[PDB]
A paper describes a structure:
The N-terminal domain of HBcAg (aa 1–149) can form a dimer and be assembled into a capsid with an icosahedral symmetry composed of 180 (T = 3 state) or 240 (T = 4 state) subunits. HAF is composed of HBcAg, along with histidine and tyrosine tags for binding to gold ions, as well as a tandem repeat of the affibody for binding to EGFR. In the HAF sequence, the affibody was inserted between α4 and α5 of the HBcAg, the spike tip of the HBcAg. The affibody used in this study specifically binds to the extracellular domain of EGFR with a dissociation constant (KD) of 5.4 nM.
HAF was expressed in E. coli and self-assembled into a spherical capsid form. The purified HAF preferred the T = 4 symmetry. A Fourier shell correlation (FSC) of 0.143 was chosen as the cutoff for resolution determination, and the final resolutions of HAF (T = 4 state) and HAF (T = 3 state) were 3.86 Å and 3.60 Å, respectively. The four subunits forming the asymmetric unit of HAF (T = 4 state) are colored in red, blue, green, and yellow. The density map of the affibody was not clearly visible since the connected linkers induced flexibility of the affibody, causing the structures of HAF to appear very similar to those of the HBcAg. Each linker composed of 10 or more residues made the affibody flexible, and thus the structure of the affibody in HAF could not be clearly confirmed even though the molecular structure of HAF was obtained. As a result, it was confirmed that HAF, in which the affibody was inserted by manipulating the spike tip, has a similar overall structure to that of HBcAg. The overall structure of HAF was not significantly different from that of HBcAg, except in having the affibody on the spike.
Author numbering:
A (entry chain A), B (entry chain B), C (entry chain B), D (entry chain A), E (entry chain D), F (entry chain B): 49 to 126, 278 to 340
Write the structure that this text describes.
């Protein structure tokens, strides 16, 4: 009975991201590797630049505690183990990837640029498939 | 793989929070009620004041999706349930409350004041029981 | 139908007063005696100082007409009486004392000081009983 | 053994209103609807303008708790239920309507204007019915 | 879940229209004839004057498509037809007339004057019938 | 016939002193010893400093003549004695100590400081025993 949209300090409420297809976001491993490779200083050093990585830290932490839960259910629990593991991938997996993808993207190209791409992607997906040019991820610095 | 400390950039490394006993932290319902009663503006309005409530949002959200997972396993799954619900209460229940307790405490009394309280509590608990003053959590605005 | 909070325009929403336990508030006779002894001028003289005593007047009047109703049901009505007298004591007795207790307390010590006392009492009661300082109502002019 | 006249900060002691006939005041529903329709901002917003609505709030609240008492005696209690309900309409009903009518009227036309109308109404009712012109509610902004 | 009422840009929220009795508003035919006779260029010419006629247009269109649906159900459906038509007039017809009545009235006599007329009629109907001066719709340029 | 309050012209009406329990006041011998040890100059030298010791003189004198009456009834009178000696101890013993206790206390710590102590003690005692801090008489120069 608490309803808070994470994406309100930066605009682009949660309803905006619902347009993007579920399978459009790349896998968790690629996003984690991108965050680690591009951003090792910011995540490790205490110097504060923006709330983006400030929230990215606990995003990674909630993902990690979910991974530890998966390891626990694999090791200590009893068929019934694989099904819960599959569920968290499809249930929390979508949310975690959305959190990771938005914050990484807005750090590289800027938070303003991703806004227009989100708006344009909404227009392109609303048109019926009878006539739509092939659109791909188009972001430029 | 690799570990990062969320409590950083406010001082108060993770090692300091290990001073406090596990059972000292109050129950989740009290923290949620206090956060609601004291703050309905910051959690809902888009205005930014500090990263504290910024991280509080994802903390509440990760707790909420944990509750949703508990509801799903209650509704769909088969003696194997109550052990899972108890486990997350004793394992993630401690971890989640730590994030919530620190942030609400440092919002009212300030992030500077809570630091010496952690130091003072550490000193108080390390003394032998043969002579110790009965201590209660002393915080005044 | 619709609800309004009397404690508003002084801060101190209704949710804050839910922190205090029901039995904490002292008995009606003590509050009436304290109000009489400390204030016979404000309650009688037409001079206005603050809305506090202004609302205190109607509070006392609603309590008085409740007492008159109790006297009437004692004098005129028929085992069905004592259950009514007990019910109003346990239902309206709590509600009336809340109005009286807040107003007299914020007159002597000030409306600003009572606020942090509510916050401090909330913090004190939310901690687990395994370690808590024995607290008494600390108010000093 | 407490005697306080509510109407002393604004003048027009309780003895002044005793002149007006009991059935002159309109029904509670009409006064509540008038207060709601004309004054939704003042009753809801914390901004303070005058003690009028400041007392109107607890007037409505005491009426509401009386209504809840009526609902309780209707639902939980056992002939003996209708009679107490009828009594509160004639006993507290007159007082509540007087409180509501005075404060609503003095907000619209001003607190000074209602004073003259009360004085003149006293003169008109003191004359024996042998010769009195028909007088009606006459208030103008 | 959508909750919004039209009467905000002009003030006078929907609660104000609840004072005036339902049967007070005249029938749809008279309002339509008045709108057609007094304002034919405003409804037809694209010239902009105020949002009043701007909303009046879709008011008329929504009423007209309701009439078209009524004709469709009359011609196509099978007792069950008449009750639906009587239903829409008593349920939807009242709401439509409020839009037309407010906008037509505020164009001739002005949006300012009609506001005081609303409260004046509201308080006038609340006074007891034993004393009320004879009042009718009083609107003068 | 008619009653006057001695404690007047220093604030602290008689009603305030009714807050303190009867047995709280210490025994007469301790008060006399404290008055002697702290003040031998004021009680003997003719110099005037305040009405406090001025009234203290007649207080001690009325107590002394009561003691003389006790000695006389012991020496001259006849089971009827000890009931009289006990009665004056329980009836005038309370009254005399009140005069002495107030005056010596307000001489050392000052008449201004003792006022809030009476208020603070009243607040402390009115709270229910379910939660109260153990209070001792806190007075510091």
């Amino acid at each position: 009975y608490y309803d808070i949209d994470p994406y309100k300090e930066f605009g682009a409420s949660v309803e905006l991201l619902s347009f993007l297809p579920s399978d459009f976001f790349p896998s968790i491993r690629d996003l984690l590797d991108t965050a680690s490779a591009l951003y090792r200083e910011a995540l490790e050093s205490p110097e504060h630049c923006s709330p983006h990585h400030t929230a990215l830290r606990q995003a990674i932490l909630c993902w990690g505690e979910l991974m530890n839960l998966a390891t626990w259910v694999g090791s200590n629990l009893e068929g019934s183990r694989e099904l819960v593991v599959s569920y968290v991938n499809v249930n929390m997996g979508l949310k975690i990837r959305q959190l990771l993808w938005f914050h990484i993207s807005c750090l590289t190209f800027g938070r303003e640029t991703v806004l227009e791409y989100l708006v344009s992607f909404g227009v392109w997906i609303r048109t019926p498939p009878a006539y739509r040019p092939p659109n791909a991820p188009i972001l430029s610095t």
